């Protein structure tokens, strides 16, 4: 089954399978182990920038993702990784630095 | 004739001729060789990022496509190419990564 | 009456929000504020007679307030035309500046 | 007026307006003036048996009256061929001029 998320105005479409693949905030969001905030149209709202959210979804899907080149973009990706509790990507970004 | 796909929230409108032109998983989706899940508006849902999907559609249509400059986007494309079993583009992306 | 927006830009399909399109003062904000005439189809897509090649970049500039410009002079010029058309004042300058390199 | 026209050019899908296609004297104007046969499908797409690589560039030249030209001579020749075919005389001249070494 598919889940649709509004992350800072950026719209995403993914599955329960992807968001529950790793131990993260998103799994906790969908396991019912945490409240999720939805609107009238059924979008899970997240008050974060959606710039790198697409990168997070890819990491969950493939278990790996190409990291950004510039150090600043690595920190941006890292910040989101820490927030969503994607420990694998957090470490991998810390390693890249 | 025309197919409309929701790829990771990115919406696309293409043709059957394009999606079935080469031997890939996308051909298999519409060759009836596979399950297709659509939403209320009739958009075929695909749980992949749609960033490079436009590039995938063009490769199937034209048999060739301009690759991105940075190594990062080529690798991103390679991941999508590998997933959809676009073997032709996979090779050129693997090849493009020379340095 | 929705905050979710779907736009047909020259045949290129985009799905975005009011939150992104109203971040800066541009033609797109006036278009969705009802402050301007809009042409929609049966399925609820606002039609826009411009190429959608660089439109994704326009949306990202509105979202993040900045975007990586293309390398070649040709594509910066392409973006400049789109930025100017949508009256994206921030992006117009940065691209006009980029051509003075 | 501002009615929408959609063309399938070699598999590339485009959305433009009557206003754009009738701005200049070209083959595309003749297509909508009924001065020439157009083949449409069940969904209302005007079919054109041409590669759609540069058609977006043709549409932009009609929209803005100008467009950034490609760098390489080969791509200028490609665009020039399409301009000649669609009878976009304005763009033909600028492409012929660009190939002046
Ligand atoms: Hg992505
Ligand atoms: Hg951001
Ligand atoms: Hg071509
Ligand atoms: Hg274009």
Residue numbers in the entry:
A (entry chain C): 32 to 128
B (entry chain D): 32 to 130
C (entry chain B), D (entry chain A): 30 to 130
Task: Please give sentences taken from the publication describing this entry.
The human KCTD family contains 25 soluble proteins that share a conserved potassium (K+) Channel Tetramerization Domain (a subtype of ‘BTB domain’) at their N-termini and have variable C-termini. Here, we present novel X-ray crystal structures of the BTB domains of a further five members of the KCTD family and examine the stoichiometry and stability of their multimeric assemblies in solution.
KCTD10 is implicated in heart morphogenesis and congenital heart failure through regulation of Tbx5 and Notch1. A second interface is additionally evident in the tetrameric structures of KCTD10 and KCTD13 as visualized by an antiparallel arrangement of two β1–β2 hairpins. Whereas the canonical interface contributes 1210 Å2 to the total tetramer interface in KCTD10, the second interface contributes 940 Å2. For instance, the scattering curve for KCTD10 was virtually identical with that calculated for the two-fold symmetric tetramer observed in its crystal, while being distinct from the predicted solution scattering curve for a symmetric tetramer such as that observed for the T1 domain found attached to potassium channels. Overall, the BTB domains displayed a range of affinities from low-to-high nanomolar: KCTD17 (Kd = 7 nM) > KCTD5 (Kd = 55 nM) > SHKBP1 (Kd = 87 nM) > KCTD13 (Kd = 100 nM), KCTD10 (Kd = 460 nM). Our crystal structures of KCTD10 and KCTD13 represent the first structures of family members from clade C. Unexpectedly, both proteins crystallized as two-fold symmetric tetramers revealing a different complex architecture to other KCTD families characterized to date. It remains unclear if all KCTD family members would form KCTD5-like pentameric assemblies, or if for instance full-length KCTD10 or KCTD13, which belong to a relatively diverged clade, would retain tetrameric forms similar to their isolated BTB domain structures.
